[PDB]
From a paper:
The [name] Serpin 42 Da gene (previously [name]) encodes a serine protease inhibitor that is capable of remarkable functional diversity through the alternative splicing of four different reactive centre loop exons. Eight protein isoforms of Serpin 42 Da have been identified to date, targeting the protease inhibitor to both different proteases and cellular locations. [name] is in the highly stable ‘cleaved’ conformation, with the cleaved RCL inserted into β-sheet A to form the 4th strand in the six stranded central β-sheet. [name] has a typical serpin fold comprising a mixed α-β secondary structure with an N-terminal helical region and a C-terminal β-barrel fold.
The first crystal form, designated [name]-1, crystallised in the C2221 spacegroup (a = 59.74 Å, b = 125.95 Å, c = 119.94 Å) and diffracted to a resolution of 1.7 Å. The structures are of high quality; the [name]-1 structure refined to a Rwork/Rfree of 16.51% and 18.81% respectively, and the [name]-2 structure to a Rwork/Rfree of 16.58% and 18.54% respectively. Within the Ramachandran plot, the [name]-1 structure contains 98.9% of residues in the favoured region and no residues in the outlier regions. The [name]-1 structure scored in the 100th percentile of structures in MolProbity, with a clashscore of 2.39 for all atoms and an overall MolProbity score of 1.02. [name]-1 has 369 amino acids from residue number 4 to 387 of the molecule, with three loops (D86-Q88, D191-R194, K367) and seven residues of the RCL (A343-E349) missing due to poor electron density - most likely reflecting protein cleavage or their mobility within the protein. In the [name]-1 crystal structure, clear electron density ends after the P1 Arg residue, suggesting that the RCL was cleaved after this consensus recognition site between the P1 Arg and the P1’ Ala residues. As such, except for the presence of an extra six C-terminal amino acids within the [name]-1 structure there are no major regions of difference between the two crystal forms. The two crystal forms of [name] are structurally homologous with no large conformational differences and an RMSD of 0.35 Å across 363 aligned residues. The last four residues of the [name] protein, corresponding to a likely ER retention signal, are not present in the density of either structure.
Numbering used by the authors: 4 to 85, 89 to 190, 195 to 342, 350 to 366, 368 to 387
Write the structure that this text describes.
Amino acid sequence: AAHQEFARRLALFSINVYGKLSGQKPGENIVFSPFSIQTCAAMARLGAENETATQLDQGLGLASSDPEQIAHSFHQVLAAYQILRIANKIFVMDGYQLRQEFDQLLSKQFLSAAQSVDFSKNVQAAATINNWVEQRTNHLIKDLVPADVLNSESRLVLVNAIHFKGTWQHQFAKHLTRPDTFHLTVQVPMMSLKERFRYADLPALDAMALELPYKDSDLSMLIVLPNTKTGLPALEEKLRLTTLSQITQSLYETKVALKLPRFKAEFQVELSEVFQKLGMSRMFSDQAEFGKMLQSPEPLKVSAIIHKAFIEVNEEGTEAAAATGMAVRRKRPIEFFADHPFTYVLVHQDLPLFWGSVVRLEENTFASS
């Protein structure tokens, strides 16, 4: 009930963000963790007041206007994963003390760690933050927070990191992978497998979908494939007309001949513009209200929200990672051949952990690091 609502609201936030990112970065293989973004921003909301807090509640789709109830809603999920590792930490300017309620909600409900750092020594502070993020993401997310967005005016950085490594319930055979056409055409490694999978025809979306489960988990990779080679932008628009829950409830087990690219993607973005377009502008402005963060009466605002994500999909399974850092400163059979662009979601039970697009693929002919 409370759990279903949390998933529903995160799913809507997810498609909202996906839509704004796709508009901001049209030809790119977007990948992001909506869960990471919402969690990090909800932590910031605990320290917000007045219209800043209200914007965050309503723009993120949080459970209510009550900080304790909001915090508890995240605890329920975070605790359930006490394959998937999620970690929160706050990094606080040396000499500044957190307010008790902010500190208590972060520690007890968001299971957040806390550490004091010297942001005036901004290279050192960034290294501390970024090393922690690497350690929470199997070194897949590097240099999350650059030194050059931190300085003596920085007061805290809130970070969420998430790491996923799953093995397919039904793995692909490596010796069956072959180069084949991806229609943008290019030749890329295509993995082939015939199995019973949860599948749906989605004719009102002009698409089809398939779920690939991971063993020893209630996690799966949902692939939504337009029926036409050029159909992804239209599908992306139409997903707004439905819900993730309605899509996954349409799935039924059936024998499928699957072809899926062996692919990887990395994506990074500063999310201020996305948040502004989703009606959460006040937090970045000189009218921002974050007086519940620190004992100090210094007015604060958000100077950056940085998100980085990574995913690799191969014959054995999937590994994915992401992190979100928010800097706060003082104010001065059926064939299912995924051989053209598609969208995908790593979903727990309609709780989306990762969301992305495959729009362009190439086999690199150059050696590189």
